[PDB]
Amino acid sequence: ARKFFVGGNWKMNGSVESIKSLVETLNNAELDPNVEVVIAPPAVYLPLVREALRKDIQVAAQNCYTKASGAYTGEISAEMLKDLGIPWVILGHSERRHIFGESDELVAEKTKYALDSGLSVILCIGETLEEREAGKTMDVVARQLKAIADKITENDWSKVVIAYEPVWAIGTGKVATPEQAQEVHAEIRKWLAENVSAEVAESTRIIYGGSVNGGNCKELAKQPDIDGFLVGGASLKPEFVDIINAKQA
């Protein structure tokens, strides 16, 4: 059975004081023991969070670059994350693909290097509104996944979690139903079965990275191919605890 996986992406949010309050709430919370939980603070707070946070929750960077070291002002490497005991990195987030123009190949290079440097990867994919209305949801996610598949080995996939972002329902005012999210997750899993292997399709957690809150997380978690969440704003809030507990009665 695929272990349920709940990631919290703080994005560009946090102070020493607000992070201390957020971490205290998580440290005091009663958490579903079969859920794998990962928190992604801004890079400058990664040591602070890793030192204060309960050890059953792991820490993620929100991005890294493609080499171990070099002349790349403003970039961090997977070796640095490993050095600091940061076992996870988010790569290919739609904000980085769109705002910062990260190419499919760049996301694939970053993924391969992070895997080879010992990290696990939350790999983000998803189609825009124009792509969805033009009928290209599956062409887009197949293309975004093929770029990684072409660079990483079959065994490399064991340390990958795929986050589906319905970019078409982020900032557009549209709302994705659990039914619509389930349909894409099932299409992602079949892409894995037919283009990577039976094992990778059965083992890879595909988590939903659309709008997730206390009000909708239980209905979303019940969908057969939704293995958890990549949560945005709600990961800054106490209801993140409820989202972690989405599979509990």
Q: Does 144 bind a copy of itself (CB under 8 A)?
A: no
Residue type, 227: D
219 tagged catalytic: no
* Amino acid letter, residue 28: N
Nearest alpha carbon to residue 89 among 230, 245, 239, 240: 230
Are 75 and 114 spatial neighbours (Cβ–Cβ below 8 Å)? no
Is 67 among the residues that bind a copy of itself (CB under 8 A)? yes
Cα(205)–Cα(230) distance, rounded to whole angstroms? 11
Partner interacting with residue 83 (select from F ion, a copy of itself, none; CB below 5-8 Å by kind)? a copy of itself
Q: Under rule CB under 8 A, which residues in 73-102 are in contact with a copy of itself?
A: 73-77, 79-81, 83-84, 86, 90, 93, 95-96, 99-101
- Sign of the Cα torsion 10, 16, 18, 21 reads positive
What's the one-letter identity of residue 152? I
Q: Which of 9, 62, 66, 245 binds F ion (CB under 5 A)?
A: 9
Task: Report the 10 Å Cβ neighbour count for 150.
Answer: 12
- Binding mask 216-245 vs a copy of itself (x if CB under 8 A, - otherwise)? ----------------xx------------
Picking from 30, 28, 53, the residue whose alpha carbon sits closest to that of residue 40 is: 53
Does 14 participate in binding a copy of itself (rule CB under 8 A)? yes
Which of residues 203 and 211 has its CB atom nearest to F ion in the complex? 211
Nearer to F ion, 141 or 201 (CB): 141
Query: Among 36, 93, 95, 102, which one carries the catalytic annotation?
Result: 93
Alpha-carbon distance of 109 to 34, in angstroms, equals 32
Q: Does the active-site annotation cover 165?
A: yes
Query: What six digits make up the tokens of 33?
Result: 């023991």
Segment near a copy of itself (CB under 8 A), from 46-54, 173-181, 200-208, 216-224? 46-54
Mask 138-177, x = binds F ion (CB under 5 A)? ----------------------------------------
107 CB burial (10 A radius; 0-12, 13-18, 19+): buried
9: contact with a copy of itself by CB under 8 A: yes
- Residue entry with tokens 């079969």: 34
Handedness of CA 101, 106, 108, 110 (dihedral sign): negative
Closest contact distance (angstroms) between CB of 193 and a copy of itself is 29
65 contacts a copy of itself (rule: CB under 8 A):
yes
Footprint of a copy of itself (CB under 8 A): 9, 11-16, 42-48, 61-63, 65, 67, 69-77, 79-81, 83-84, 86, 90, 93, 95-96, 99-101, 232-233
Give the residues lining the site for F ion (CB under 5 A): 9, 230, 232
